[PDB]
Amino acid sequence: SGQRWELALGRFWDYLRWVQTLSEQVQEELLSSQVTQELRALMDETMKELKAYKSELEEQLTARLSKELQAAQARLGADMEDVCGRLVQYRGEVQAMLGQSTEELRVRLASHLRKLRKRLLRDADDLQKRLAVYQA
Known part of the structure; x- marks a missing residue:
């Protein structure tokens, strides 16, 4: 709901920020696949919460905004995927x-x-901001 997918995105952010440091611990876990498995997990939780949220909004409302929203949705997912793919x-x-x-x-x-x-x-x-305008 409103902050559910946001809180999940925040957890991805928290982890990413640690990874960015590329200290030797990050490296140990990067090479053992732990970092990528965990970031991937946080990304999936995020996109699924967002999917559920947008579906609930779509459900209770009486369409360009809509298609753009999908795209914005894809943009975030791709950003997170790229991060993962980079690691x-x-x-x-x-x-x-x-x-x-x-x-x-x-x-x-x-x-x-x-x-x-x-x-x-x-x-x-x-x-x-798009999810906010979309709201019925």
Whole structure:
């Protein structure tokens, strides 16, 4: 409901913010698949809560707003998917480097995540304001 999918998105954010640091613990868990499994779990919880919320809104109301909303919905999902895909890719690349320095890979991952965070910010804000106008 209103804040349900938002609270779930907040939990994805909390985790992402820790991952962004790419400390050695993050790295241990990135390479063991724990980070990606958990972020993926938080993303799924988010999109499903959003789906349920938008479906309930759609149900109680008496259509451009609608199609745009779907798209805004897709944008957030894609932002979260990209984050996940970025981390999964990093793991794959590192495991193929045979112990060689991962420095450049991490600098690049960091930059990708900083950019996606700016996207998550505006995309969620856009979804929030659209869901609010949609309301019957």
